[PDB]
Amino acid sequence: GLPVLNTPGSNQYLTSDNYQSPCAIPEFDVTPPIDIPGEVKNMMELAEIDTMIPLNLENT
Amino acid sequence: GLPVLNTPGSNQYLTSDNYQSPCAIPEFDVTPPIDIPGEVKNMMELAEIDTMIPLNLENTKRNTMDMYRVTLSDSADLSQPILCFSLSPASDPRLSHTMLGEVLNYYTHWAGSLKFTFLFCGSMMATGKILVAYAPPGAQPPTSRKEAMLGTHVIWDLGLQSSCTMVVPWISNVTYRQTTQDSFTEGGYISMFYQTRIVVPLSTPKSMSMLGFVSACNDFSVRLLRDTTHISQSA
Amino acid sequence: GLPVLNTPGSNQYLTSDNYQSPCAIPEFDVTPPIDIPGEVKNMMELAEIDTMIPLNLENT
Amino acid sequence: VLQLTIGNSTITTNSVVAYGRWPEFIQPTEPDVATCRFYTLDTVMWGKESKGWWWKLPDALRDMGLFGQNMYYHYLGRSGYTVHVQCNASKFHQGALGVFAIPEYCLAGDSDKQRYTSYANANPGEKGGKFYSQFNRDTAVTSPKREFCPVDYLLGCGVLLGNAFVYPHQIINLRTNNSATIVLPYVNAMAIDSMVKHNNWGIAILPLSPLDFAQESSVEIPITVTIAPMCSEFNGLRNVTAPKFQ
Amino acid sequence: QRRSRSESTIESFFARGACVAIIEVDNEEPTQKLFAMWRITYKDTVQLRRKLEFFTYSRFDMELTFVVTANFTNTNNGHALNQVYQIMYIPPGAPTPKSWDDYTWQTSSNPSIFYTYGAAPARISVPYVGLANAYSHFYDGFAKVPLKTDANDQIGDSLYSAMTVDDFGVLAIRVVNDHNPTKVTSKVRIYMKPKHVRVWCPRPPRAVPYYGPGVDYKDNLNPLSEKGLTTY
Amino acid sequence: QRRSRSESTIESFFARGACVAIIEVDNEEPTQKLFAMWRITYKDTVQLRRKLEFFTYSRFDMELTFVVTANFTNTNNGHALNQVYQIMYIPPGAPTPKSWDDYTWQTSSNPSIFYTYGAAPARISVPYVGLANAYSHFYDGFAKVPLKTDANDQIGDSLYSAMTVDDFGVLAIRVVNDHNPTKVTSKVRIYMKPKHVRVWCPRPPRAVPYYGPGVDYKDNLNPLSEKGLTTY
Ligand SMILES: CCCCCCCCCCCCC/C=C/[C@H](O)[C@H](N)CO
Ligand SMILES: CCCCCCCCCCCCC/C=C/[C@H](O)[C@H](N)CO
């Protein structure tokens, strides 16, 4: 068929990749999402929350 | 030619995939389809069909004809329930083997309103009121009619109508219950009591049987297809 | 390059397939066809031809 | 009261249409009168200990009227059916008859050899057959009966009788109705098929609730199965087929 | 209502590939396992069968996937190069091979796959090759009719619910490699994925274990378990 | 302000595939490691768990990648052909295999992968298969309630923070190849990459080592180290 050329990096698994994959459970009617409070869209939104500091760190 | 990159998951066979494949017999003039009656476009269409329930499952009545009919009579005690079973259409021994349960055993998740049509097989001169009650889970099973009438319930006059449709509305915390028996996604409790005992005149069979048919409503659906536990193959 | 996914059925040879293949003799000036009589476009055209039947099949 | 008349046969009474499809045609030979009669099968007594009865269609209508003659003379014929199961019961008779119309009603044999039942025993015809509480294995190795061993709760096909309502069904509940009518269209993988060898349908009259009457010891009421071939058209007229029934 | 029936569709209900047969093929010396002809049918395994017996008639474009798994037998230290397996179709009528080195393996008109061991499992799609307008999972008749004029009873004696003896031919699997002293026993598992499935006249599923290619049953006729009448 | 939050997104925070389980599968003789059923959960490993326990609820389309690494055990000079590993899903309820040569491996409706050793790791995407509208990393309740009318305390005795016993079924991995005298011990590492992640109700991460599948803890309850109050 179409002549392809396997470039270096084939048949590998890079944990940080966005490659597609076959859906193991096709035509799966997932549960519709509800408006749950406290949705986090970014991790820094958690850093912006002021959290108490373990300032004192003596042995006792 | 075109530089490609074999992503992880190549040269594998996932049984659940829609990949194309070479036609082994190309240019094959298949037989044209005809309009055969009873076309099924969805498995739930089979669950919507009301099928008799093996309600009675005693050691001597199961796996026979006695398991499909429940014996009720005027001599039967009114304080004790007629029949009782959890709303586990796929894991309850009574509902698991029903067509509904047979289709659910092939799926993991199920969600919908059920329908229990109880048919009276007594004489036309036999009258009475049967209280059919659905009690959602989270409380004591309705061991008494006073507890059963607190939840959803319907009074069925045996004289007026020979079959009563007890629709179990879809009430659940999770969007989909599991088909296995588990206490978090448990369905509920279906029970029957004598609102008014069966009253039969003379020359009438005092003890009569009844049938129960479980069915799925239009809102009923399933997901997470799986293998049924019913069938087996020794190897 | 382009991330591909080798589906099941790869590196096989199915005798009944219409996959492309590299031309072993490229830029090959084939002989032009002539109007030869008796062109058969379908095998059933041969079945439509009435052919004598070995009706009698005794041992002798 | 419903009074359904077809050809030269009238039946007075609800009727259900199998799979929501009415018997209709697809040069076939269609007797518009000679094959539309409601042929009445042999009446069967519904004993108190009865387990059920089963007939094969069109095998049941093989010796009744000109329908059987057209079925044997012609090679392949398609025919819808209208099965009226009438059970005369009084107000004091209790019971329920599941009338199931199984498409391709394959039954199980008694012998250990699978699919070993003979053609004569698999096609009883107007006589039909009966279900049995348990599965009695054939033990005559010298002369195997080669007959079905239909089990009530297994429907003779290993499935549960409770799920048998997936088929076109009708419940004769003696308290509300004394008769049932099922209109079966021609159901088959083929548009038309040989009827002498193939049985398009199978009617199963199974007592879902036992028959009782005034606390009597033994009670038996008649059940009459009247089958009407609707839109029966045959093709391939040729010498009559005379099957061996022994 | 609002929940979709996607996973419940017939196409989705049979979207899974089911092992329908396990074929043992060896490259032993001529001492019968050189090749193996398996009659193509889903009734060797009960799961996909039961899924199909849910309905009376079916029409689906099948998809067969062959997973070949080979091992060294009768040798602790065994060697053999990568084997190529020939999976040839022999539809009803095509000459079946009588040996490994048979002419029928030439596959002049029989479709065949040559799967190199270690590669992706050999997948091929097959259209609806049924003679009728739909596959007949259940047949309430015979192939012959014993007539009054038959000389003997075996002339018309046919198997019940059996349409054709050669239903859809045999799948002949062999090791294309020459017979090596090192015996490599291979198991070809055939997985059947019905596609474009259209089913007709639903039927309840078998509640008792299967027994043969028909609807017969011998033992284990107790599907339901013991349970109280009023026990939740 | 001007610096983008791309790497900090929830989709990016879980964009990495994390080893969630290591399954040991052998092809030994029938002397129990022939197959192995691992209850699918991220709580066998603490890293991806802690990343998920950052939030109370989650909804993500998972992506499982199986990396199979095989070795020869109990043999210095061992031989075996390329093995094929069957990774079958057994959702809650599907019959689990009791042996290697079990019928449930036919996968008539259970989704399964057949990974040929040496090929690219077996990757498959799974949608949000949660019963609720979001995955419950934390559950402040039980599955049962011990009632006053219960005959015994074990009727309603349930594990705290445990919703279902069979949470999402078991992943059954076996070697499809026949049992060879040469024992090939394989380790299937499952890597979980949550995709399309939507998280709700953030929670602080566990500062002490995990202990079981709940929020319990036994030892190593000293997260902070010694440091002066006025020491920079
Ligand atoms: C490598 C070439 C292999 C080609 C394989 C194509 C063979 C086609 C046969 C598929 C037919 C199986 C589906 C039909 C099932 C039947 O309905 C049942 N056996 C009962 O009738
Ligand atoms: C080869 C087929 C494999 C198919 C794999 C799909 C299995 C689907 C299960 C994934 C669910 C894991 C994510 C859910 C985590 C839960 O929230 C936690 N266990 C706690 O609730």
Residue numbers in the entry:
A (entry chain 3), C (entry chain 3): 1 to 60
B (entry chain 3): 1 to 235
D (entry chain 0): 82 to 94, 99 to 111, 121 to 340
E (entry chain 1), F (entry chain 1): 66 to 96, 100 to 300
From the primary publication:
We generated PV3 SC8, containing eight stabilising mutations distributed across the VP0, VP1 and VP3 capsid proteins in the PV-IRES expression cassette in shuttle vector pMVA-PV3 SC8_PV-IRES. A total of 9,630 ‘best’ particles from 1,465 micrographs were subjected to three-dimensional (3D) reconstruction, yielding a structure to an overall resolution of 3.0 Å, as judged by a Fourier shell correlation (FSC) cut-off of 0.143. The MVA PV3 SC8 capsid was clearly in the D-antigenic conformation due to the absence of openings usually seen in the expanded state12 and the overall particle diameter of ~300 Å. The hydrophobic pocket of the VP1 capsid protein subunit was in the open state and unambiguous cryo-EM density was observed for a long-chain fatty acid molecule of ~18 carbon length bound within, which likely corresponds to the sphingosine observed bound in the native virus. This would appear to correlate with the observed stability of this variant. Disordered regions corresponding to those frequently reported for natural ECs were observed e.g. the N-terminus of VP1 from residues 1 to 65, and the N-terminus of VP0 until residue 82; including the entire region of polypeptide that would correspond to the mature VP4 protein in PV. Seven of the eight stabilising mutations were clearly distinguished in the density map, the unobserved mutation (equivalent to T67A in VP4) being located in a disordered region of VP0. The thermostability of PV3 SC8 was compared with PV3 IPV. The PV3 SC8 VLP shows significantly improved D-antigenic thermostability, maintaining 50% D-antigenicity at temperatures exceeding 60 °C. In contrast the genetically stabilised PV3 SC8 VLP was produced with high levels of D-Ag, very little C-Ag, had enhanced D-antigenic thermostability compared to IPV, and induced a neutralising antibody immune response at least as good as that from the current IPV vaccine. In contrast in the MVA expressed PV3 SC8 VLP, the pocket factor is observed at high occupancy, suggesting that the mammalian cell environment is beneficial for the synthesis of authentic particles like those produced by WPV infection of its host cells.
Poliovirus (PV), belonging to the Enterovirus genus of the Picornaviridae family, is the causative agent of poliomyelitis, an acute infectious disease that can cause paralysis, mainly in young children. PV has a positive-sense, single-stranded RNA genome encapsidated within a non-enveloped ~30 nm icosahedral protein capsid. Mature virions containing genome are composed of 60 copies each of the VP1-4 protomer; whilst in naturally occurring empty capsids (ECs) formed during PV morphogenesis VP0 remains uncleaved. The D-antigen elicits protective immune responses but can be converted to the C-antigenic form, for example by heating.
